[PDB]
Structure formats: structure tokens, C-alpha cells
Ligand binder design. Structure first.
Ligand code: CA
Ligand code: CL
Length: 496
């Protein structure tokens, strides 16, 4: 469960949040493959409630109605097509598995679902599965409301309803089997692994019992004996009786401390500066690198949900965001996931984004295709961060330096830092309010290197800054504090 199962030389997953399957399939072929992306996390591919008040929010996808592969992202033929086409060019698909629960208990019975399946929350009836009242934790939960009231009580966090979401009885073999049946459907199609939604809300042992029933990965694409990559969503910033480490048996876990801390550092909030990153990783109290799934922002916390609060950096704070993502992708700690977002009409009112619920760009609820502009950005309000040159090139920097040790660290005692990854790459950051102008040891072979942040290597030349490493490995760097991207990255494959 710990191996990503990406092709060799590919080291990151991108969350193509709310994208349609036909658009992901094409994106695999025209961009993700040639740019060395390891894989794609997809939005939940199983039928959900169509919530019309408010109008088709992103979070309707976290309220299952069945395990039919029938969503606003597309139907089962399209899902299958996407997975095949992506695997065929060496790009993996990881599914957002929503397995803790079905829909909200107070949602109306009917066929308001992405595939038209009938369901009845009040009578606990999901006949497209099928599930009935026997399959939920109503009699196990010991709270008065039946919902989770107190996170200091680990038992109720598992057995009671998360904000009224009907809590599946994952202690029962029948439920475990229906869920395993769904995941095996996906595995056999070609899926390489899963993001396990709401993992904190499930017993580690129950997740174990589900994983036990799963196939090895599809043997046309994966070496026989391959197990799905598993990364479990657990928000653990400390102080709770439930801990990220409690889930290590099943796979990797999301390290939400990562982006929260990094956001604070890059904003220079709370007395924090980049020189303190010399011991980034377990030195900052994070989980082991070999279990961490790390990220600057995710789909929840980029809009003030889950955890991290105000320190979280997003495409909205583009300049600082690029630096944060670049530091992530250069640093050996964790397995890296890059967000890819859509622009929504963000509007604050006494501190809240009242449009934090808004779903993807749409025409009367039909998700818009992803168009690609002339300059290779996206239209139709798709932000496509993974296509920003500064991010895309840092995704390849992580590939090129894969396995190399953190070395040649430099800092000025403030916010001017640099470090290398063995002899394959070097990166330099200026987050101070004055210029960074200094000759530094890079660890690299002598040569002329393109800066992959300001530009690209194209057949014998560079479209941006050029860095000149001398025979002793030293090279001069000059980054103004008013630079739009106040960092520079070079590596073995950016060398002329
Ligand atoms: Ca639960
Ligand atoms: Cl997540």
C-alpha cells in the first residue's frame, strides 16, 4: 500500500479537481505524460446526490447514493476510457474513495442523484447498492444527536455521523464486501490506488478489513503482486486521541501539518522564516517521510474547510504559492501531490467566503470542458496550476533529483536560503525584503544551466535566466526581492 505504482522517474500526483474523464484522458496524452507527471487524483467517480440548494456544490460528491460510476465527471464508459488511455502513456489514476458514509440524513428521498438512482436517507434505503438500515451505525452511536459532537471521544468520531452524514457499519462483513466490490471494480479497470476519504472517521481495523478483500493491480499494466497505493485522509495537527500513526498499517497518510506550517513560513507569519526550514521534515514534528502524503493546499483547505486556516497558500496568492510548491517539490520529504483548481467567485462577509460551496465551472450544472489557451493555460475558469511553468518545471526537478540527498544548505539567518539534491539539482529562494546576490556551492557539474523557473531549455538555449556553474561547483545568483518569482531552480536536465 506504500508504493505509489507510478512509472519509474515519475514522482508526483496532481489533483484534477472536478475535471471530467474525457478531459483527464486527453490531459494524460497531451501534457501529463510528456511532462513527467506520475498520476492523477480524481474526484469521487461513484454516484452522488444532486444537491440543488445551494446549486451543485463541490461537496455533493462527498454524499454517495450508489457505487455506479456515474457522475458529473462522466459515466462508466468514459471512466474506463480515461484509465486505459492514461495507463497507456504511463500516467496513473488514483480514486477518491468515499467509503465512511452515504448522504446526509436529512436529504430528501427521491431520484436527485447523478445517475437517477432512487434513495431514501430517512428510511436508510439505498437499493442501488443495496444498503438498508441494518447497514448503518444508528444503533452503535452513543451520542444524543446521533452525530459527532466531541472529537475528544475517539469512539463517537468513528461510530457517529459526521455532520449528519449516514455512517456505514463498516464492522459488518456485508458492508465491507459491497465497498470492496466497488474498489475492485476500479482496480480491475486500471486504477493504481486510492485517496481514502474521512479515514479518521473509520477504525483502522475496519479499513484493514476492506483492504484485505482487494485484488492486486491490473496485470496488463502493473507487475504481478502490485498492491494499490493507499493514502488516507486524516487531519491530525496534534492534541486529539486519534493520531495519523494509527493508520500506518493501511498505507500513507495525509500530513496536514505540512502546508499549514509551510504557509506560515512563506507568509513570514508568527515569527517564522525560511532559514528555519533547514530541518524541514520530522524535525518539524511531522510523521515519517515514507508515510507522508504532502501538499501545500487541498480542495477543502484552499477554501477555508478542513484545517490549516488562514495560513494556507493557494493560487489566489500566486507569487508566494509558487515558491511554496517549489520548495515542496525540491525537498525530499514525503510523496508530493500538486493541486489543480477552478476559479470560483470568492466573496467575503464578516470573514467567511460565502461562495466556498460553489462547484466547478458549469452551464446549468453541466461541468464545462477544459479548454486550452494558445499560451497553454486553461480557459473556462480552470486555473490549471499544474500547467504554470514554475510548477510544471518543479515537478520535473523532483523527477530528475529523485533519490538524491538534501545537501549544500545555505541560509542568511533570515529568508534567503538555498539547497541542493546531491549532484542533480539546486534551488535558491529570496523571501527577504532586500536583494539576494551571492556566489554559492551548487554541487553540480560545471556548465550553463537554464533556470526552469523563469524559463525552459529548448534545443541548445534557454528562454529565461542562465546560471553559470564553474569547475568548483560555484555559481552566482542574483534575485531581487521585487522579482515576480523570487527563486531559481536548475538541474541536470536543464544543462546546455
Ligand atoms: Ca464512521
Ligand atoms: Cl486530502
Amino acid at each position: 500500500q506504500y508504493s505509489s505504482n507510478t512509472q519509474q522517474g515519475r514522482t508526483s500526483i496532481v489533483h484534477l479537481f472536478e475535471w471530467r474523464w474525457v478531459d483527464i484522458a486527453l490531459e494524460c496524452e497531451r501534457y501529463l505524460a510528456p511532462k513527467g507527471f506520475g498520476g492523477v487524483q480524481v474526484s469521487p467517480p461513484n454516484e452522488n446526490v444532486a444537491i440543488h440548494n445551494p446549486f451543485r456544490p463541490w461537496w455533493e460528491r462527498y454524499q454517495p447514493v450508489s457505487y455506479k460510476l456515474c457522475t458529473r465527471s462522466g459515466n462508466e464508459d468514459e471512466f474506463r476510457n480515461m484509465v486505459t488511455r492514461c495507463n497507456n502513456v504511463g500516467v496513473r489514476i488514483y480514486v477518491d474513495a468515499v467509503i465512511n458514509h452515504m448522504c446526509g440524513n436529512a436529504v430528501s428521498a427521491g431520484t436527485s442523484s447523478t445517475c437517477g438512482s432512487y434513495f431514501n436517507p430517512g428510511s436508510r434505503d439505498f437499493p442501488a447498492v443495496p444498503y438498508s438500515g441494518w447497514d448503518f451505525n444508528d444503533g452503535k452511536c452513543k451520542t444524543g444527536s446521533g452525530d459527532i459532537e466531541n472529537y475528544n471521544d475517539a469512539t463517537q468520531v468513528r461510530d457517529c455521523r459526521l455532520s449528519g452524514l449516514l455512517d456505514l457499519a463498516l464492522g459488518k462483513d456485508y458492508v465491507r464486501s459491497k465497498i470492496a466490490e466497488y474498489m475492485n471494480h476500479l482496480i480491475d479497470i486500471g486504477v493504481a490506488g486510492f485517496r481514502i476519504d474521512a479515514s479518521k472517521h473509520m477504525w483502522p481495523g475496519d479499513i484493514k478489513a476492506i483492504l484485505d478483500k482487494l485484488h492486486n493491480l491490473n496485470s496488463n499494466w502493473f507487475p504481478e503482486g502490485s498492491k494499490p497505493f493507499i493514502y488516507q485522509e486524516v487531519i491530525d495537527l496534534g492534541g486529539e486521541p486519534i493520531k495519523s500513526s494509527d493508520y500506518f498499517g493501511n498505507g500513507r497518510v495525509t500530513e496536514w501539518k505540512y502546508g499549514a506550517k509551510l504557509g506560515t513560513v512563506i507568509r513570514k507569519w508568527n515569527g517564522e522564516k525560511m532559514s528555519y526550514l533547514k530541518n524541514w521534515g520530522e524535525g518539524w514534528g511531522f510523521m515519517p517521510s515514507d508515510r507522508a502524503l504532502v501538499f501545500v493546499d487541498n480542495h477543502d483547505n484552499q477554501r477555508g474547510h478542513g484545517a490549516g486556516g488562514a495560513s494556507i497558500l493557494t493560487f489566489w496568492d500566486a507569487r508566494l504559492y509558487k515558491m511554496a510548491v517549489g520548495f515542496m517539490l525540491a525537498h525530499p520529504y514525503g510523496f508530493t501531490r500538486v493541486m489543480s483548481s477552478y476559479r470560483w467567485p470568492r466573496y467575503f462577509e464578516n470573514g467567511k467566503d460565502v461562495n466556498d460551496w460553489v462547484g466547478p465551472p458549469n452551464d446549468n450544472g453541466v461541468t464545462k470542458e477544459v479548454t486550452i489557451n494558445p499560451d497553454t493555460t486553461c480557459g473556462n475558469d480552470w486555473v490549471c496550476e499544474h500547467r504554470w511553468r514554475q510548477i510544471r518545471n518543479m515537478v520535473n526537478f523532483r523527477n530528475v533529483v529523485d533519490g538524491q540527498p538534501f545537501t549544500n544548505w545555505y541560509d542568511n539567518g533570515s529568508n534567503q536560503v538555498a539547497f541542493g539534491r546531491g549532484n542533480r539539482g539546486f534551488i535558491v529562494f529570496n523571501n527577504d525584503d532586500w536583494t539576494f546576490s551571492l556566489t554559492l556551492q551548487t554541487g553540480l557539474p560545471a556548465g550553463t544551466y537554464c533556470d526552469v523557473i523563469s524559463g525552459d531549455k529548448i534545443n541548445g538555449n534557454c528562454t529565461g535566466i542562465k546560471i553559470y556553474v564553474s569547475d568548483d561547483g560555484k555559481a552566482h545568483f542574483s534575485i531581487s526581492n521585487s522579482a515576480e518569482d523570487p527563486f531559481i531552480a536548475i538541474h541536470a536536465e536543464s544543462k546546455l
